[model samples]
Target: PENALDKLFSSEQQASILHVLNTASTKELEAFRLLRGRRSINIVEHRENFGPFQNLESLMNVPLFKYKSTVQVCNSILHHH
Candidate 1:
């Protein structure tokens, strides 16, 4: 099977991607797979309502979003660099 991120993003892009997540707006997370549109927007809303995520695992707190695939994506992104 093919992976959207495997050949699509560079190491530099990966770094920037995390930066986007760390201080990203609603739409930035859409390209990553687990989140999109309203789902991505809600995360921004949650961040706005609370504070920014204290940990990557905080993303799992989003209702109905905490799936094994999401975690796999999260670890792959966060673990690399």
Candidate 2:
């Protein structure tokens, strides 16, 4: 059945999706920052303040984040047990 989680997550999350596609490494964290910078999201402060997100909803608090973006990002970031 359709649920909030379906609406919440798309096909992939931002960080992990980018990592998967880009083969990003710890060094590429800065590259991720650069990519997100284009969207006006502050990657530096976000990393320092929030770190890896424990929940998908937290993306909303990040700058320039919205429902669609959160959903897409959550798709890759979240893992269900």
Candidate 3:
């Protein structure tokens, strides 16, 4: 059926990573790679001042963030979980 491996692998990891990113607090966010210290603080502030992260790239809204670092952050968060 459609419930095979392909469906489960498709974008679910993305959902899992983004789910944590969108919902985590500053302290918890620090657990992620490249998100330690002020970067974690910036994530909280960015969400509070604006809104939740909508995608991987949306993390750039935080200070000291870029796609290069963003990918690591997502990977770390995913691996950490």
Compose the digit string of candidate 3's lDDT tens values, residues 1-81. Answer: 253222333377778877887788888988776888999888878888888776666776778987668777777877786
Q: Write the per-residue lDDT of candidate 2 for residues 33-75, one digit (tens) a residue.
A: 3234433334435645667554445556677768777565445
In order, what lDDT does every prediction score? 0.57, 0.46, 0.74
Clash pairs for candidate 2 = 12-76, 13-73, 13-76, 14-73
* Candidate number that wins on TM-score, 1 or 3: 3
Ten consecutive residues with minimal summed lDDT in candidate 2? 18-27
Best first by lDDT, ranked: 3, 1, 2
lDDT of 1 by residue, 1-81 (tens): 144332344556555444555676665566656565566787777777877665454556666555565455565445443
Candidate 3 wrongly placed segments (more than 4 Å): 1-10
Candidates 1 and 2 compared: the better one by TM-score is 1
Q: What's model 3's overall lDDT?
A: 0.74
| Cα displacement (Å) at residue 16, model 3 | 1.0
Q: Could you give the candidate ranking by TM-score, starting with the highest?
A: 3, 1, 2
Worst 10 residues of 3 by lDDT: 1-10
* Model 2 C-alpha lDDT versus the unseen true structure: 0.46
